[model samples]
Target: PVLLRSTDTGQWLRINPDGTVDGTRDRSDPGIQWQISPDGNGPVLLRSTDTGQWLRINPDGTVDGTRDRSDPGIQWQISPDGNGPVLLRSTDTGQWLRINPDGTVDGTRDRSDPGIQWQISPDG
Candidate 1:
């Protein structure tokens, strides 16, 4: 499970063996949250109760560009690029972006880039 805590609120999404979540968002729990896949993948969820936005987490633990951002939902991806996984996301601006492992963001119109979102976790 991904252990996430902020201020006085804490939540976790127990991932299944297939890399899917067991329980889902109630659509009512209002707070900052970090959701991760159980299978040790990358990408996670960074939700803010104030803005109701859920930012996608990269394999390297950085927030994927503004891809598909919104109040309570977003998505991202990570895939093998020769050796290591390359991360990408659909920004809120309708632009596809590649968030490098070093934290540089490259924007483009190519949605065919190789990437896939996976399980992510935090240390403590």
Candidate 2:
């Protein structure tokens, strides 16, 4: 289990009951907890403990959640930043999951963007 906190915004990655993925300021909310699972031998999967849905980076480069593990867009790569935070890159688009200023999650090609860095905590 892990809690992904956006390094730039100080928000935790959240998954709503409706399966929408976003950043929430609430730290005690169980809806923000995630189970990081390896997607077989390929990319990894971020499964929401709140709704049992897997985080998905859609074709449009937007982030969301899905119940189907077989969904092609649900795979992601966990890249270490070497210093502190880690990067969640969408295997679907080869883009990094970034925290937009508006608190929304999106994919970007910019690896140098600090907004894409996430502090991964094991104790959620």
Candidate 3:
């Protein structure tokens, strides 16, 4: 499990119990912790250790947490952006999970966008 820190926003990815997602600066909160596990095929699953939910890309490209591991949107690929952080690409939409300018999480098709980069570090 690691803390996903947004490179551009410098906030940690936090999943609320209500299934909504956000980026916040409160690193001491357990709701911000995540467990990124590799899938059998290629992509990975971002599981919330706080609520035991999985981060998923909705049909509208919005990011949310779900308990359904079988959900197709729950799968994501870790793509390197070259200089820093990694892009989290949705396996279902092929869109990158981006931290928007407002600190909201969403899927975007802009591969060249630097705001999509994220730093994953083990939280000790």
CA-lDDT, candidates in order = 0.34, 0.85, 0.87
Q: List the residue pairs that clash in candidate 2.
A: none
Model 3, residue 4: displacement in angstroms? 0.5
Q: Write the per-residue lDDT of candidate 2 for residues 1-124, one digit (tens) a residue.
A: 8899999999999887777778989888777888889868768888887789988887788888888878878888888879789988887788898888788888889988878999999873
Q: Where is model 1 more than 4 Å wrong at Cα?
A: 1-53, 56-73, 91-94, 98-107, 110-124
Ranking by lDDT: 3, 2, 1
Best by lDDT: 3
> What TM-score does model 1 achieve against the real structure?
0.27
Residue-level lDDT tens digits of model 1 in 1-124: 2232211112222222332222223323333234433223444344433333345433333333232444212443433345433333433334333333332333444556422312233433
**Candidate 1 least-lDDT 10 residues:** 5-14
lDDT of 3 by residue, 8-111 (tens): 88988999768899888888877898888898789889999879999999879899998997899999999875866888988898988888768788888988
Off by over 4 Å in 3: none
TM-score of 3: 0.93
Cα deviation of 14 in candidate 3 (Å)? 0.4
Candidates 1 and 3 compared by lDDT, better number = 3
Could you tell me every candidate's TM-score relative to the true structure?
Answer: 0.27, 0.92, 0.93
